[PDB]
Amino acid sequence: RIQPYHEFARNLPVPTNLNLIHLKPLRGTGLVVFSPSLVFIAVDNLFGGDGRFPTKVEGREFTHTEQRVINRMLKLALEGYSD
Amino acid sequence: MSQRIREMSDNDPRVVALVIRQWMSND
Amino acid sequence: MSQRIREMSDNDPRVVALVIRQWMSND
Amino acid sequence: MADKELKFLVVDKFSTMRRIVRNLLKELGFNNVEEAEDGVDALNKLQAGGFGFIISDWNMPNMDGLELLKTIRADSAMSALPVLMVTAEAKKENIIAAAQAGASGWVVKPFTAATLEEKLNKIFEKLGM
Amino acid sequence: LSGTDKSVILLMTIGEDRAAEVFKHLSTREVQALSTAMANVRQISNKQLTDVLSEFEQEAEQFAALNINANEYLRSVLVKALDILETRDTTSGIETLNFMEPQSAADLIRDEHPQIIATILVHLKRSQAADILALFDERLRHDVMLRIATFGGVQPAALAELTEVLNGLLDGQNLKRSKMGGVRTAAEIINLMKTQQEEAVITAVREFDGELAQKIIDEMFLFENLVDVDDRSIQRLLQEVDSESLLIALKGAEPPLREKFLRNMSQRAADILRDDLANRGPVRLSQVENEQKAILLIVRRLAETGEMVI
Amino acid sequence: LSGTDKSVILLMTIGEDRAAEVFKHLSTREVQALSTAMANVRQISNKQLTDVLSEFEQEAEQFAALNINANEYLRSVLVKALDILETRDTTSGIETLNFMEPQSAADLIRDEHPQIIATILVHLKRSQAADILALFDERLRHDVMLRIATFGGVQPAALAELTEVLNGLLDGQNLKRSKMGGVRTAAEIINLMKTQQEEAVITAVREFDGELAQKIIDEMFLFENLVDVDDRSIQRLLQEVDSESLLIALKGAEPPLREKFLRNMSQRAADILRDDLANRGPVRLSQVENEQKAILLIVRRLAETGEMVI
């Protein structure tokens, strides 16, 4: 879907993990948006979560371990996108 | 540290391996 | 200050580290 | 149109969520926003008066959203004050209890700015604002 | 010192080249175990060196060295004149599929093809295969039994491939070496809580899942279950429990458990304990809980030594 | 001299190059501790040198030196032939997550993901995890318990990353090493004030927050609470309190506390104290407060030695 930036911002659930990326040599800053549900699912899978107890988003900031998990996911996503 | 260290260093590695295997089996 | 200072200075640093570790553990 | 000088009280146990809600309200044209960390502080600030709308979280320390809503409704001076409920889990029993308590609206985390704007517009239309 | 420790000291004291040469004649499991043990070495004393060297000499004389490498020698002799370690590894895997818990093996092979399950169980011990089959559902268990009854033999290549796959799965499991996460670990955690939070957690788990809470309850020793323990174990327990500690702990115990303890004591001691219980004033619940915790620790210690059956 | 002091003297007396070489074989915590201890060194006497050198020689002979660097030797042997310190560090972090106060650890991991909390508690001791769970709210605690009940194991990489993050948080906390700022510190401050300002501060804090004042009150020993202390501790206290000091202090004490003190004294001494109280004239409140402060200091000294329970 192609739409103005304000419409895209208006349809983003909050809070959310927003990652700024650069696509060299093109000029500008790209965004990789990770929903909290996906982050929680990845954290569950990485740390032995059975998946039977979904974690409800309380609106809190991501912890340092969650930040590192997001880091790893973003690195994998950027490698895949570049390839 | 007598000559026993040097004498043991000249033993066949297979002998050392068998001694190690027996020691681990006895555990 | 007898020769013991010089003898201790020639010891392996790993030995000194292990002695330090044991001393700190005993605290 | 709703009065842009309407005073909003945002109650949540997380400061980041309160800041996000305040920024969303500012983007909607409401600049008079105050924040409360729990139900006790929210009630203390309500006793000061001057508020026209409340956005409160369900699970908060020392007082949950349902008890705060019941206390607000039990007060004659604030029984008509609209309260918006924001939660992380939309259990049917909790929603029914809040509706019986007199909740003006319900929002489920996570949500978008469009959903919050729609809820505010619906609440204002119901109140004739 | 264990044999692994002696071997590690020997490898450390012979030089890096000699130790590397010795590793070439050792299996992967032995090399991994020695490397793990070599990792945690912090110091080797004079006795730990001299005794190890002397024992190594006596062991080298025990089997009188010799034993040229069997595989290379056999291959050379066969080539000049004209199974083996693969057969030994298959036999070891057969052994490995018998020392495991029946539940673990059953869960490992539950999703396998019924013919594969039957083939695996044929090479296993009768008791282990019997226990594994007991944990399967009716249909799958009976299908495996019928396939066993008509087992026609497996080619060596297919058996070797199955053994290799099972070895890979076992290597993955050992790398994981799953830390105890079942109801037993929670029960151990729950038993060390205060009564308030322990009961609250138990009730909440029952609210979520009554079966799960019951499993945790069945795996926990929260006192008041010593009535179900045999008289001999209780009598053994009383020899290690202080009289005052037992008196304080039994103050908050139910009359059935109190009579269970009294019946296992001597009549004079039973009368003394009854008089002390009747005469001693109220005791704070925290002290009684602490004494019961100490008695439970004594019970656990006795059970670990085999002197008490729970 | 502690072992750290002896190690510091040894490092100072072997030269800068040798000390630097020794630091390369020590962990970061040990190096930091030695550097901190080396910082405060002002003088090393003849005994502090000779005894340290002799003890170092006897210790080097105790484990007979040896113990070539395990990591480098193991790596070389594995490379030539074909966990470790990472596993040891993970084990140490497991130990580190058990020696802390349950409240501190619970607050540290309160905001973590429930699966992360469950994973951490699985590797912890049963008692420590039980205490941590007791401090969580009902919903989060029960969610963590349910996740523990269905714990399926964690990959080594994720566990290592979590351990590294926890180690970083612990390093930050230790760098802070938060000086005691809770209600206990204020209670210690308040107990050393005069009665006027002490009561004024307590009343004002209650005006601001009754719960906060009650917490400070519960953490302070402002006398008149010795009635709630056991009889044995009071009897032990009377052996260290001067008769005149007790007489002056008990002049302004309530009749319940006065009878509590009298009941723990011998009957002749109790009668003497009663007669002195009845016959002695009025005593200035400042002197009574000073005597009560001295008695409280004696109580604190006895409690620190374990002879008195508060």
Alpha-carbon distance A24 to nearest alpha carbon in chain D (angstroms): 31
Q: Look at strands A17-21 and A30-34 and give their pairing.
A: antiparallel
Burial tier of E195 (Cβ tally within 10 Å: 0-12, 13-18, 19+) = middle
Give me the amino acid identity at F54: S
What's the CA gap between F151 and A66, in Å, rounded?
A: 19
Mutate: best of C9, C10, C24, C26, partner F, most F CBs <10 A: C24
Alpha-carbon distance C23 to nearest alpha carbon in chain E (angstroms): 14
- Identify whether D110 is preceded by a cis peptide bond (ω within 30 of 0): yes
Residues written for chain D: 129
- Identify whether E282 is preceded by a cis peptide bond (ω within 30 of 0): no
Alpha-carbon distance C5 to nearest alpha carbon in chain F (angstroms): 8
What's the CA gap between D71 and D49, in Å, rounded?
A: 15
Residues 6+ apart with CB under 8 A from E289: E194, E195, E252
What's the CA gap between E108 and E241, in Å, rounded?
A: 44
Give me the amino acid identity at D50: G
Mutate: best of E43, E45, E48, partner C, most C CBs <10 A: E43
Interchain pair D111, A14: CB under 8 A = yes
What's the CA gap between E158 and E306, in Å, rounded?
A: 44
Mutate: best of F18, F36, F71, F73, partner C, most C CBs <10 A: F18
Nearest to B18 by CA among F168, E16, A54, E26: E26
DSSP states of chain F as a string? Answer: --HHHHHHHHHHHS-HHHHHHHHTTS-HHHHHHHHHHHHT-----HHHHHHHHHHHHHHHHHTTS----HHHHHHHHHHHH--THHHHHHHHHHHHHHHS-HHHHHHHHTTS-HHHHHHHHHTS-HHHHHHHHHTS-HHHHHHHHHHHHT-----HHHHHHHHHHHHHHHHHHHHH-----SHHHHHHHHHTS-HHHHHHHHHHHHHH-HHHHHHHHHT---SS-GGGS-HHHHHHHHTTS-HHHHHHHHHTS-HHHHHHHHHTS-HHHHHHHHHHHHHS----HHHHHHHHHHHHHHHHHHHHTTSS--
Alpha-carbon distance E83 to nearest alpha carbon in chain B (angstroms): 21
Q: Do chains A and D touch (3 or more CB pairs under 8 A)?
A: yes
What's the CA gap between E59 and B25, in Å, rounded?
A: 13
What's the CA gap between A36 and A15, in Å, rounded?
A: 8
Give me the amino acid identity at D22: R
Q: Look at strands D8-11 and D53-57 and give their pairing.
A: parallel
What's the CA gap between E285 and E193, in Å, rounded?
A: 14
A21 near A30, Cβ under 8 Å? yes
Residues 6+ apart with CB under 8 A from E107: none
Alpha-carbon distance C8 to nearest alpha carbon in chain F (angstroms): 8
Tokens of F261: 């003190």
What's the CA gap between E92 and E90, in Å, rounded?
A: 5
A64 near F111, Cβ under 8 Å? no
Q: How far apart are the first and last CA of chain F?
A: 33
Tokens of E133: 């089959």
What experiment produced this structure?
cryo-EM
* Neighbouring C-alpha atoms within 13 Å toward the C-beta of D67: 11
Nearest to D110 by CA among F218, A55, E175, E124: A55
Nearest to E109 by CA among E90, E92, E128: E128
What's the CA gap between F308 and F300, in Å, rounded?
A: 8
Phi, psi of F34 (to 5 degrees): -65, -40
Tokens of D62: 């020392």
Alpha-carbon distance A7 to nearest alpha carbon in chain F (angstroms): 31
Nearest to B19 by CA among E8, E45, E28, E40: E8
Interchain pair F25, C17: CB under 8 A = yes
Cα distances (Å, whole numbers) of residue D43 to D69, D70, D72, D87, E96? 10, 11, 8, 19, 66
Q: What is the DSSP letter of A41?
A: H
The greatest distance separating any two alpha carbons of chain F, rounded to the nearest whole angstrom, comes to 94
Nearest to E262 by CA among E222, E285, E231, E220: E231
Interchain pair F83, E36: CB under 8 A = yes
Q: Look at strands D33-36 and D8-11 and give their pairing.
A: parallel
Resolution in A: 5.6
Three-state SS annotation for chain E: CCHHHHHHHHHHHCCHHHHHHHHCCCCHHHHHHHHHHHHCCCCCCHHHHHHHHHHHHHHHHHCCCCCCCHHHHHHHHHHHHCCCHHHHHHHHHHHHHHHCCHHHHHHHHCCCCHHHHHHHHHCCCHHHHHHHHHCCCHHHHHHHHHHHHCCCCCCHHHHHHHHHHHHHHHHHHHHHCCCCCCHHHHHHHHHCCCHHHHHHHHHHHHHHCHHHHHHHHHCCCCCCCHHHCCHHHHHHHHCCCCHHHHHHHHHCCCHHHHHHHHHCCCHHHHHHHHHHHHHCCCCCHHHHHHHHHHHHHHHHHHHHCCCCCC
What's the CA gap between D103 and D81, in Å, rounded?
A: 10
Report the residue of chain F nearest C6, measured CA to CA.
Answer: F14
Distance between alpha carbon F225 and the CA centroid of its chain, in Å? Answer: 24
A12: chain D residues, CB-CB within 8 Å = 112-113
Cα distances (Å, whole numbers) of residue C3 to C20, F9, F12, F21, F53? 21, 17, 17, 21, 11
Helix (H) and strand (E) counts in chain B: 2, 0
**CB-based contact, E13 to chain B, within 8 Å:** yes
Which run of H or E residues covers position D121?
helix D113-126
Distance between alpha carbon A24 and the CA centroid of its chain, in Å? Answer: 21
Give me the amino acid identity at F180: M
Distance between alpha carbon F229 and the CA centroid of its chain, in Å? Answer: 23
E56 near B8, Cβ under 8 Å? yes
Phi, psi of E151 (to 5 degrees): -70, 120
Which run of H or E residues covers position B10?
none
CB atoms closer than 10 angstroms to residue D100: 10
CB atoms closer than 10 angstroms to residue B3: 7
What's the CA gap between B18 and F57, in Å, rounded?
A: 37
Residue burial F133-162, b: 16+ Cβ < 10 Å; e: rest: bbebeeeebbbbbbbbbbbeebeeebbbbb
For tokens 């439970």, the residue is: E296
Which run of H or E residues covers position C11?
none
E295 near E241, Cβ under 8 Å? yes
Q: What residues are paired with A32 via a beta bridge?
A: A19
Distance between alpha carbon E294 and the CA centroid of its chain, in Å? Answer: 25
Phi, psi of D111 (to 5 degrees): -140, 165
Residues 6+ apart with CB under 8 A from E69: B14, E25
Burial tier of E111 (Cβ tally within 10 Å: 0-12, 13-18, 19+) = exposed
Tokens of E101: 């818990």
Nearest to A36 by CA among D22, D105, F148, F113: F113
Q: Look at strands D83-87 and D53-57 and give their pairing.
A: parallel
C14 near F59, Cβ under 8 Å? no
Cα distances (Å, whole numbers) of residue F238 to A7, F270, F286, F294? 80, 12, 22, 13
Q: What residues are paired with F136 via a beta bridge?
A: none
Residues 6+ apart with CB under 8 A from E271: none
Cα distances (Å, whole numbers) of residue E214 to D109, E51, E106, E182, E254? 35, 53, 23, 13, 21
What's the CA gap between F223 and B14, in Å, rounded?
A: 78
What's the CA gap between E42 and A45, in Å, rounded?
A: 37
F14 near C16, Cβ under 8 Å? yes
B23 near E59, Cβ under 8 Å? yes
* Neighbouring C-alpha atoms within 13 Å toward the C-beta of F56: 29
Report the residue of chain A nearest F109, measured CA to CA.
Answer: A63
Nearest to A43 among F111, F113, F150 (CB): F113
Nearest to E226 by CA among E295, E272, E127, E155: E295
Alpha-carbon distance E225 to nearest alpha carbon in chain F (angstroms): 20
For tokens 């990789």, the residue is: A32
F15 near C9, Cβ under 8 Å? yes
Interchain pair D112, A36: CB under 8 A = no
C18: chain E residues, CB-CB within 8 Å = 42-43
What's the CA gap between E232 and E255, in Å, rounded?
A: 20
C8: chain F residues, CB-CB within 8 Å = 10, 14, 53, 56-57
Residue burial F97-121, b: 16+ Cβ < 10 Å; e: rest: bbeeebeebbebbeebbbbbbbbbb
Query: Contacts from E28-37 at CB under 8 Å and sequence distance 24+?
Result: E30/B20, E30/B21, E30/B24, E31/F81, E31/F82, E33/B24, E33/E4, E34/B20, E34/E4, E34/E7, E34/E8, E35/F74, E35/F77, E35/F78, E35/F84, E36/F83, E36/F84, E36/F87, E37/E4, E37/E5, E37/E7, E37/E8
Distance between alpha carbon A34 and the CA centroid of its chain, in Å? Answer: 2
Burial tier of C17 (Cβ tally within 10 Å: 0-12, 13-18, 19+) = buried
What's the CA gap between E226 and E289, in Å, rounded?
A: 15
E247 near E277, Cβ under 8 Å? yes
Tokens of E106: 């059953």
Nearest to E216 by CA among E183, E181, E180: E183
CB atoms closer than 10 angstroms to residue E58: 10
Q: What residues are paired with A21 via a beta bridge?
A: A30
Cα distances (Å, whole numbers) of residue D24 to D13, D19, D83? 18, 9, 17
F186 near F202, Cβ under 8 Å? no
Tokens of A81: 């996108």
Tokens of E148: 């066993």
Three-state DSSP class for residue D46: helix
Cα distances (Å, whole numbers) of residue E112 to D106, E131, E140, E169, F284? 49, 17, 11, 13, 91
For tokens 């060297």, the residue is: E53
Nearest to A10 among D12, D59, D112 (CB): D112
What's the CA gap between D81 and D52, in Å, rounded?
A: 6
Tokens of E149: 């009854």
What's the CA gap between E54 and E9, in Å, rounded?
A: 12
E38 near E8, Cβ under 8 Å? yes
A69: chain F residues, CB-CB within 8 Å = 161
Which run of H or E residues covers position A59?
none
Report the residue of chain D nearest A56, measured CA to CA.
Answer: D88
What's the CA gap between F283 and F245, in Å, rounded?
A: 12
What's the CA gap between F104 and F102, in Å, rounded?
A: 6
Nearest to B22 by CA among E47, E6, E41: E6
Measure the CA dihedral D41/D47/D49/D54, to 10°: 40
Q: At what angle do helices E183-191 and E195-208 cross, to 10 degrees?
A: 150
Burial tier of E253 (Cβ tally within 10 Å: 0-12, 13-18, 19+) = buried
Residues 212-231 of E with CB under 8 A from F: 212, 216
